[PDB]
Amino acid sequence: APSVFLFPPKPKDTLMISRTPEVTCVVVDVSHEDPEVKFNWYVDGVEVHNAKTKPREEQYNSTYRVVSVLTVLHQDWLNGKEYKCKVSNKALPAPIEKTISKAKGQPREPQVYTLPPSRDELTKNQVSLTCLVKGFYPSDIAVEWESNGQPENNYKTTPPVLDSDGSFFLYSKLTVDKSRWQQGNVFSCSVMHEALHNHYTQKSLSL
Amino acid sequence: SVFLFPPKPKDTLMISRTPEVTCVVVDVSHEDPEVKFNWYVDGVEVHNAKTKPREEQYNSTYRVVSVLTVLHQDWLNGKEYKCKVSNKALPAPIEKTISKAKGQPREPQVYTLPPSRDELTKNQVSLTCLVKGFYPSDIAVEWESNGQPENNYKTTPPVLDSDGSFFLYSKLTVDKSRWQQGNVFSCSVMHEALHNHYTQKSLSLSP
Ligand SMILES: *[C@@H]1O[C@H](CO[C@H]2O[C@@H](C)[C@@H](O)[C@@H](O)[C@@H]2O)[C@@H](O[C@@H]2O[C@H](CO)[C@@H](O[C@H]3O[C@H](CO[C@H]4O[C@H](CO)[C@@H](O)[C@H](O)[C@@H]4O[C@@H]4O[C@H](CO)[C@@H](O)[C@H](O)[C@H]4NC(C)=O)[C@@H](O)[C@H](O[C@H]4O[C@H](CO)[C@@H](O)[C@H](O)[C@@H]4O[C@@H]4O[C@H](CO)[C@@H](O)[C@H](O)[C@H]4NC(C)=O)[C@@H]3O)[C@H](O)[C@H]2NC(C)=O)[C@H](O)[C@H]1NC(C)=O
Numbered sequence: 301a302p303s304v305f306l307f308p309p310k311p312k313d314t315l316m317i318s319r320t321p322e323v324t325c326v327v328v329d330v331s332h333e334d335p336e337v338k339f340n341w342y343v344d345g346v347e348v349h350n351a352k353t354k355p356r357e358e359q360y361n362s363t364y365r366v367v368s369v370l371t372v373l374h375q376d377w378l379n380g381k382e383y384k385c386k387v388s389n390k391a392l393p394a395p396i397e398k399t400i401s402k403a404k405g406q407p408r409e410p411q412v413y414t415l416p417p418s419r420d421e422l423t424k425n426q427v428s429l430t431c432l433v434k435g436f437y438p439s440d441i442a443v444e445w446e447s448n449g450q451p452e453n454n455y456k457t458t459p460p461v462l463d464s465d466g467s468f469f470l471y472s473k474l475t476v477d478k479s480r481w482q483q484g485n486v487f488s489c490s491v492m493h494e495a496l497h498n499h500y501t502q503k504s505l506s507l
Numbered sequence: 508s509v510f511l512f513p514p515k516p517k518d519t520l521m522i523s524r525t526p527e528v529t530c531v532v533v534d535v536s537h538e539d540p541e542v543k544f545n546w547y548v549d550g551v552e553v554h555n556a557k558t559k560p561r562e563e564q565y566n567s568t569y570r571v572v573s574v575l576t577v578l579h580q581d582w583l584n585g586k587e588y589k590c591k592v593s594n595k596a597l598p599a600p601i602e603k604t605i606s607k608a609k610g611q612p613r614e615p616q617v618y619t620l621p622p623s624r625d626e627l628t629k630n631q632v633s634l635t636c637l638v639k640g641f642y643p644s645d646i647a648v649e650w651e652s653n654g655q656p657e658n659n660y661k662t663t664p665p666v667l668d669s670d671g672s673f674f675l676y677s678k679l680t681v682d683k684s685r686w687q688q689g690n691v692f693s694c695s696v697m698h699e700a701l702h703n704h705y706t707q708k709s710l711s712l713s714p
């Protein structure tokens with residue numbers, strides 16, 4: 301019998317007016333015997349009609365996969381609207397329902413702090429530039445690094461972690477050739493979040 | 508449904524502790540709840556597992572569990588632990604295997620980072636412990652001061668770095684005053700690839 305997965309928009313998508321945030325309702329394990337899928341969409345319990353439902357794609361395990369995509373208003377998502385996908389199939393005793401929304405709670409502003417490498421790490425060929433991002437809510441967030449207006453690609457960011465006050469934190473780690481750090485180049489940690497002014501801040505780091 | 512859980516990292520690294528592998532069984536009904544367990548170590552049956560007396564969950568389903576005690580070195584030497592389960596609702600007995608992640612162990616580099624200047628505005632401050640370059644990801648991190656344990660800390664999960672090794676960050680939050688006074692704070696790290704399975708690095712206010 302069929303299964304349903306509801307996917308939220310990307311954090312970046314909801315924070316920038318230029319981007320297009322979407323909610324996606326994927327349905328898997330639809331059979332040949334009853335292959336028709338109907339989708340119904342609701343926003344805060346109210347039906348909407350603007351969703352674009354893709355034609356169904358057969359898969360290698362001889363089950364059908366069908367996707368539906370609802371485009372979402374930036375402010376609706378940020379204002380906490382609930383997005384419901386109702387999925388109907390003649391193989392299902394009742395239509396499956398999933399709901400998704402922005403995590404509930406008062407948004408909190410990220411504190412962004414850049415940390416230089418430890419003295420001890422200077423023995424090595426490469427060094428670690430650390431960006432601590434703390435006290436934010438909800439956990440939806442995007443983090444990036446750049447230098448001299450151009451993007452630094454050798455970095456990893458930890459997932460968000462629930463702190464003891466109910467807020468979230470994370471760390472991002474940029475790895476650069478020691479030489480570059482020594483020369484005095486400026487490195488910048490960019491952070492995108494709803495509780496930031498213009499949904500964006502950045503903090504710089506150098507010696 | 509059956510889920511096989513490994514030991515806690517701390518348990519396998521200290522001879523005093525008792526590492527255990529746990530075989531948790533979910534969705535057990537009242538009509539046919541007569542669960543059995545068979546355990547094998549490297550394909551060889553072992554009879555020293557203790558099965559837990561049962562508890563029941565919020566739904567009509569029961570939550571059931573068995574626990575096998577494990578030799579420290581067996582787990583560190585990569586032995587395979589198999590849990591076999593039979594039930595009246597089951598067409599066939601479910602079975603699962605688990606073991607330590609394969610690969611050459613790699614030693615953690617541990618670096619302590621003091622708070623950013625900007626965070627000094629606040630009532631509390633963040634002491635950061637960067638732990639990098641370790642393999643496998645099983646690891647334990649702790650903080651202490653004056654030989655006594657600091658409780659107000661959180662540690663990120665391990666994150667896969669670009670070289671195939673893992674890193675993480677641990678964040679200790681202390682009252683700003685304490686940092687100012689010049690107290691010494693220490694980040695303790697436990698891992699298989701460390702000498703005596705243990706290292707620690709200290710942090711304090713350096714004029
Ligand atoms: C038959 O085949 C199909 C398709 O398989 C084809 O494709 C290949 C994979 C390959 O196998 C090929 O041979 C086949 O032709 C199978 O469909 C698959 O079915 C599984 C379920 O069995 C389904 O479930 C998992 O997927 C969720 C994540 O999916 C995203 O990421 C995947 C990679 O990680 C992608 O493959 C997938 O497309 C999808 O990708 C995202 O798509 C959106 C929309 O397009 C994009 O916007 C997005 O960017 C993109 N991301 C990425 C990274 O690409 C995963 O989340 C599901 O997890 C939940 O379900 C489990 C319960 O089953 C829970 O254990 C789990 O915790 C998750 O749910 C939690 O709990 C509940 C929900 O249960 C929530 O309330 C809660 O919030 C949630 N989170 C928690 C608790 O934290 C799940 O693991 C696969 O996605 C699906 N594959 C595809 C391609 O659709 C089918 O199984 C086969 N059938 C049989 C019988 O064999």
Ligand SMILES: *[C@@H]1O[C@H](CO[C@H]2O[C@@H](C)[C@@H](O)[C@@H](O)[C@@H]2O)[C@@H](O[C@@H]2O[C@H](CO)[C@@H](O[C@H]3O[C@H](CO[C@H]4O[C@H](CO)[C@@H](O)[C@H](O)[C@@H]4O[C@@H]4O[C@H](CO)[C@@H](O)[C@H](O)[C@H]4NC(C)=O)[C@@H](O)[C@H](O[C@H]4O[C@H](CO)[C@@H](O)[C@H](O)[C@@H]4O[C@@H]4O[C@H](CO)[C@@H](O)[C@H](O)[C@H]4NC(C)=O)[C@@H]3O)[C@H](O)[C@H]2NC(C)=O)[C@H](O)[C@H]1NC(C)=O
Pocket residue numbers: 508510512513528529530531533534564565566568570
């Ligand atoms: C009736 O209720 C029960 C009880 O649940 C209670 O929990 C509450 C939160 C509440 O919501 C309510 O549900 C109840 O009060 C329901 O059962 C629960 O749900 C599922 C059963 O479908 C089951 O499996 C999921 O969790 C697995 C891990 O659970 C650990 O962590 C949970 C917290 O996140 C704990 O709740 C849980 O106890 C367990 O905790 C660990 O336990 C050991 C004990 O030894 C400790 O040592 C350990 O420290 C401890 N804590 C933690 C934090 O670790 C999870 O692994 C499962 O995920 C995999 O399998 C899914 C298949 O369902 C895949 O979809 C998914 O991708 C996962 O990943 C892949 O799995 C394949 C194998 O399938 C691997 O090969 C592959 O490598 C792997 N890839 C990955 C990860 O990339 C799964 O999500 C819960 O355990 C169970 N809860 C309990 C408490 O037992 C039940 O649904 C209800 N009944 C009905 C009919 O609905």
